[PDB]
Design an enzyme around this catalytic site. Structure first.
Site, PDB file in Angstrom:
ATOM      1  N   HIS B   8       0.825  -1.211   0.000  1.00  0.00           N
ATOM      2  CA  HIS B   8       0.000   0.000   0.000  1.00  0.00           C
ATOM      3  C   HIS B   8       0.848   1.244   0.000  1.00  0.00           C
ATOM      4  O   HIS B   8       2.046   1.190   0.257  1.00  0.00           O
ATOM      5  CB  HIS B   8      -0.988   0.046   1.190  1.00  0.00           C
ATOM      6  CG  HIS B   8      -0.339   0.105   2.535  1.00  0.00           C
ATOM      7  ND1 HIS B   8      -0.036  -1.024   3.265  1.00  0.00           N
ATOM      8  CD2 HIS B   8       0.013   1.155   3.317  1.00  0.00           C
ATOM      9  CE1 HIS B   8       0.496  -0.676   4.422  1.00  0.00           C
ATOM     10  NE2 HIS B   8       0.543   0.642   4.476  1.00  0.00           N
ATOM     11  N   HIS B  67       8.216  11.468  -6.592  1.00  0.00           N
ATOM     12  CA  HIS B  67       6.871  11.505  -7.132  1.00  0.00           C
ATOM     13  C   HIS B  67       6.414  10.114  -7.508  1.00  0.00           C
ATOM     14  O   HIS B  67       7.200   9.172  -7.563  1.00  0.00           O
ATOM     15  CB  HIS B  67       6.798  12.432  -8.344  1.00  0.00           C
ATOM     16  CG  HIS B  67       7.754  12.077  -9.439  1.00  0.00           C
ATOM     17  ND1 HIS B  67       9.071  12.463  -9.429  1.00  0.00           N
ATOM     18  CD2 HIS B  67       7.576  11.363 -10.573  1.00  0.00           C
ATOM     19  CE1 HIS B  67       9.667  12.016 -10.521  1.00  0.00           C
ATOM     20  NE2 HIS B  67       8.784  11.341 -11.229  1.00  0.00           N
ATOM     21  N   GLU B 116       2.456  12.014 -11.296  1.00  0.00           N
ATOM     22  CA  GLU B 116       2.722  12.117 -12.716  1.00  0.00           C
ATOM     23  C   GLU B 116       1.817  11.175 -13.498  1.00  0.00           C
ATOM     24  O   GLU B 116       1.635  10.030 -13.111  1.00  0.00           O
ATOM     25  CB  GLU B 116       4.172  11.758 -12.979  1.00  0.00           C
ATOM     26  CG  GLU B 116       4.560  11.660 -14.433  1.00  0.00           C
ATOM     27  CD  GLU B 116       5.941  11.068 -14.579  1.00  0.00           C
ATOM     28  OE1 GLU B 116       6.596  10.863 -13.541  1.00  0.00           O
ATOM     29  OE2 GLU B 116       6.376  10.793 -15.719  1.00  0.00           O
TER      30      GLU B 116
HETATM   31  C1  LIG Z   1      -2.551   1.428   5.902  1.00  0.00           C
HETATM   32  C2  LIG Z   1      -2.195   2.887   6.076  1.00  0.00           C
HETATM   33  O1  LIG Z   1      -0.776   3.070   5.970  1.00  0.00           O
HETATM   34  C3  LIG Z   1      -1.326   3.280   7.285  1.00  0.00           C
HETATM   35  P1  LIG Z   1      -0.603   2.075   8.469  1.00  0.00           P
HETATM   36  O2  LIG Z   1       0.801   1.573   7.886  1.00  0.00           O
HETATM   37  O3  LIG Z   1      -0.311   2.861   9.695  1.00  0.00           O
HETATM   38  O4  LIG Z   1      -1.550   0.822   8.775  1.00  0.00           O
HETATM   39  C1  LIG Z   2      11.468   7.887 -14.737  1.00  0.00           C
HETATM   40  C2  LIG Z   2      12.092   8.649 -13.591  1.00  0.00           C
HETATM   41  O1  LIG Z   2      11.076   9.301 -12.820  1.00  0.00           O
HETATM   42  C3  LIG Z   2      11.924  10.175 -13.602  1.00  0.00           C
HETATM   43  P1  LIG Z   2      11.052  11.083 -14.962  1.00  0.00           P
HETATM   44  O2  LIG Z   2       9.494  11.163 -14.641  1.00  0.00           O
HETATM   45  O3  LIG Z   2      11.578  12.472 -14.905  1.00  0.00           O
HETATM   46  O4  LIG Z   2      11.243  10.433 -16.407  1.00  0.00           O
HETATM   47 ZN   LIG Z   3       8.408  10.165 -13.274  1.00  0.00          ZN
HETATM   48 ZN   LIG Z   4       1.316   1.546   6.092  1.00  0.00          ZN
END
Ligand SMILES: C[C@@H]1O[C@@H]1P(=O)(O)O
Ligand SMILES: C[C@@H]1O[C@@H]1P(=O)(O)O
Ligand SMILES: [Zn+2]
Ligand SMILES: [Zn+2]
Lengths: 147, 148
Positions: B8, B67, B116
């Site tokens: 997750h 990102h 992105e």
């Molecule tokens: C599942 C959501 O990330 C939170 P936790 O890691 O505190 O359970």
């Molecule tokens: C693929 C790697 O994250 C970088 P970009 O989004 O700048 O290509």
């Molecule tokens: Zn990227």
């Molecule tokens: Zn978590």
């Protein structure tokens, strides 16, 4: 709509130290390295590291934002050892209920938070499903006796 | 031992009502559950969670390139740019792209997490980078050279 996850990119201050963490700790497979980048395959996931050398990385410590990877219970035990052997920054977890299932939280050299977690989303739901259930007494639809 | 893949992702948010609306309308995540300080989504099979943290500082994040990217088609990328503008999404101008990078749009959630929409694959990119190494390669040990 969206078709799924494409890649995740991490801004790193020291490309060689981070490459070793992502290989050792996250067991990512290196594909290609350049002067300011690294790409890895982590079980199908494209992970990129990109360098930003002189940027501030001290507020990231305050946010619970993190990414978790799936591990078994024995794997979690063996990875805690690994994070100790490798001088990783291991976070003390939030308090947990047993049904929360087990986790280990830690960060990379630049403060990105990661978790190794032994459960699934549906486990987390059955857990919450069970407690809704524990707070229900008239199952609307059921047949009552003596009326 | 082993890892098995992304379990997750959790985003610390300041405003739960505003964030859920973002993840629903921009990322198109399906809200599955909601509480005072948490919300769980499913997005194409990914577990996304928001956890509220009302009063932390969220300045420096804007300076970091980390990102998350999602795959979309080129027509979808066009559609999505209008979706973002209409909903007043903080759009970033993005880095300079070779056409070979494939098209992308970068933007942030209201607490500064960068996202992105990307139209290329790791395959595309590695092949792009390899097609560059090929261009700077001129001899093949192996071929029948003609005068040794
Ligand atoms: C599942 C959501 O990330 C939170 P936790 O890691 O505190 O359970
Ligand atoms: C693929 C790697 O994250 C970088 P970009 O989004 O700048 O290509
Ligand atoms: Zn990227
Ligand atoms: Zn978590």
């Amino acid at each position: 709509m969206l078709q799924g996850i494409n890649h995740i990119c991490f801004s790193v201050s020291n490309l060689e130290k981070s490459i070793e963490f992502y290989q050792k700790i996250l067991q990512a497979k290196l594909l290609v390295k350049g002067r300011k980048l690294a790409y890895f395959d982590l079980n199908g996931l494209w992970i990129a590291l990109n360098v930003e050398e002189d940027i501030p990385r001290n507020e990231i410590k305050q946010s619970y934002t993190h990414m978790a990877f799936t591990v078994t219970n024995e794997a979690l035990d063996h990875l805690k050892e690994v994070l100790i052997q490798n001088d990783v920054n291991i976070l003390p977890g939030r308090e947990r209920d047993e049904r929360d299932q087990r986790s280990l939280y830690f960060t990379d050299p630049d403060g990105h938070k990661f978790e190794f977690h032994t459960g699934t989303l549906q486990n987390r739901l059955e857990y919450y499903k069970e407690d809704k259930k524990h707070m229900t007494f008239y199952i609307a639809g059921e047949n009552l006796y003596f009326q």
